[PDB]
Amino acid sequence: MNPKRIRALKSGKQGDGPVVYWMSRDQRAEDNWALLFSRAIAKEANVPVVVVFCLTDEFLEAGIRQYEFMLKGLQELEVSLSRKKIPSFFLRGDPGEKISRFVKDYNAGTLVTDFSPLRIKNQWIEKVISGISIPFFEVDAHNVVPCWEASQKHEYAAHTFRPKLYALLPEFLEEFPELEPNSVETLSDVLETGVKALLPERALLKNKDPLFEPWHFEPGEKAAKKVMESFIADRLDSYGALRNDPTKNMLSNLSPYLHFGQISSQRVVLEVEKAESNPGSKKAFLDEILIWKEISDNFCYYNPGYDGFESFPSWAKESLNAHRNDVRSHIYTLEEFEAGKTHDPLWNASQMELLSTGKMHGYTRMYWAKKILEWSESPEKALEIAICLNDRYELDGRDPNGYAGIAWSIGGVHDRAWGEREVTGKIRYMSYEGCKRKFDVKLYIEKYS
Numbered sequence: 001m002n003p004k005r006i007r008a009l010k011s012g013k014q015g016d017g018p019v020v021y022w023m024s025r026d027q028r029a030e031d032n033w034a035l036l037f038s039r040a041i042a043k044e045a046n047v048p049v050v051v052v053f054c055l056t057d058e059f060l061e062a063g064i065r066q067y068e069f070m071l072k073g074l075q076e077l078e079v080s081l082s083r084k085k086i087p088s089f090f091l092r093g094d095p096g097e098k099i100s101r102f103v104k105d106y107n108a109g110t111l112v113t114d115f116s117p118l119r120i121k122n123q124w125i126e127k128v129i130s131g132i133s134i135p136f137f138e139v140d141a142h143n144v145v146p147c148w149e150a151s152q153k154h155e156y157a158a159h160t161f162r163p164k165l166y167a168l169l170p171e172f173l174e175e176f177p178e179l180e181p182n183s184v185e186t187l188s189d190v191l192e193t194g195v196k197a198l199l200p201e202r203a204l205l206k207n208k209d210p211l212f213e214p215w216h217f218e219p220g221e222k223a224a225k226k227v228m229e230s231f232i233a234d235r236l237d238s239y240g241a242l243r244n245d246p247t248k249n250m251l252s253n254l255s256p257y258l259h260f261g262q263i264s265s266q267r268v269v270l271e272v273e274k275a276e277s278n279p280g281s282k283k284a285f286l287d288e289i290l291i292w293k294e295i296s297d298n299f300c301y302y303n304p305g306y307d308g309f310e311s312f313p314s315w316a317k318e319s320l321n322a323h324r325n326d327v328r329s330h331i332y333t334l335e336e337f338e339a340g341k342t343h344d345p346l347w348n349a350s351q352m353e354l355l356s357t358g359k360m361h362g363y364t365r366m367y368w369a370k371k372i373l374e375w376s377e378s379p380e381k382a383l384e385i386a387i388c389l390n391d392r393y394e395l396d397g398r399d400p401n402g403y404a405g406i407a408w409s410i411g412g413v414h415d416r417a418w419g420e421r422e423v424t425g426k427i428r429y430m431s432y433e434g435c436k437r438k439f440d441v442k443l444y445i446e447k448y449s
């Protein structure tokens with residue numbers, strides 16, 4: 001029950017009513033530090049614990065592909081919490097109004113939320129603390145090491161973040177205690193009206209055939225566990241050598257579950273650590289899910305402008321500024337990028353995989369973002385194009401990994417300077433020819449036509 005995982009957002013008079021767990025980022029019942037800590041206060045105050053989820057008005061900025069995935073998991077989560085005698089209340093509207101009224105109407109004793117370094121979450125918090133007088137607590141249930149404890153400042157590179165995080169692993173990498181059970185309407189109806197409001201925004205092909213294919217990733221806490229088990233048994237050993245090959249589905253495919261909190265990253269690392277495998281494959285995977293995933297939270301926590309040109313490293317800002325007026329080979333607008341109407345078939349295939357499956361391969365994701373910088377009027381124009389496309393079509397989008405990853409590809413955050421080139425300056429450059437020497441670009445293109 002390590003107290004380093006919890007910050008105090010605002011102190012106040014401890015109410016005599018139930019502890020309310022405001023669930024935003026970690027939509028699961030198993031392996032949830034925020035859920036288990038909320039139960040701890042409930043036992044200490046002789047009072048039950050309840051869970052509240054807010055359905056905000058920002059869902060219309062994304063597609064149905066993310067709406068049903070989240071809502072389907074919440075339907076499963078509702079059953080799980082009822083098995084432990086924990087009621088779950090689902091509210092519609094924005095949290096600033098909804099959380100304040102629910103606390104007043106229920107006389108909540110303590111308010112607990114999970115941690116997210118995103119700008120929108122801080123916006124919701126700022127409205128909440130100005131509407132309640134009960135204590136407000138928040139718990140990092142997303143990172144193995146708490147984000148404010150891994151580092152106290154912005155980390156310039158992964159090689160400076162790795163020694164700090166690994167030094168704290170023996171303390172924070174621990175098992176999850178069991179969620180002991182306890183001593184504003186239906187979920188299906190909200191789904192019904194949600195798609196009806198989103199249906200005009202459906203991504204469609206020429207013949208009005210829906211582009212999205214929902215059979216690639218089943219949502220829910222249960223489906224996440226099988227994916228983790230399938231990756232360890234079947235794909236973990238080849239991960240070290242085939243993670244850069246989009247033609248092979250050797251990735252873990254855990255990101256849609258990780259983003260929604262349907263599976264805990266600590267559970268993944270615990271299971272991978274005791275599994276016996278090729279030694280590189282374990283280290284390569286551990287680097288992504290521990291170093292790179294949790295440095296993405298660090299990037300968003302300590303940079304208020306994580307989605308802006310201002311948060312780029314000084315060398316990258318100077319190089320891109322010096323190459324701002326360089327004539328670009330081609331310029332594409334947002335619609336051409338969206339529908340895949342560029343001269344690059346490799347980029348077009350990556351966009352089609354994104355539009356069809358909702359999860360573009362990690363290696364082609366780097367190629368996809370860097371070509372936006374090459375084919376945009378300004379680095380700022382490419383930054384918003386990349387963010388707009390990523391948050392709209394990726395199942396794992398609107399995530400700290402997304403903004404950190406875009407910043408890495410476009411602004412070279414958590415990277416070093418490379419050879420000076422036109423337009424892109426010293427930013428790491430990936431070429432169509434270089435991709436051909438790494439993997440078979442042909443079979444990747446045919447698969448997504």
Ligand SMILES: Cc1cc2nc3c(=O)[nH]c(=O)nc-3n(C[C@H](O)[C@H](O)[C@H](O)COP(=O)(O)OP(=O)(O)OC[C@H]3O[C@@H](n4cnc5c(N)ncnc54)[C@H](O)[C@@H]3O)c2cc1C
Pocket residue numbers: 243251252253254255258259288289290292293294296360361362363365366369390394396397398399401402403404405406408409
């Ligand atoms: C431009 C760009 C945008 C991205 N947008 C997102 C996004 O919106 N959401 C998202 O979850 N990831 C994003 N990624 C990070 C990475 O692409 C995905 O985490 C990864 O592709 C997810 O597929 P996987 O789980 O099967 O890969 P795996 O090889 O299995 O990786 C395992 C886990 O490690 C983490 N991870 C892996 N690679 C990275 C990385 N480069 N940075 C941070 N964490 C990583 C992920 O949590 C991942 O689930 C982005 C990467 C780039 C370059």
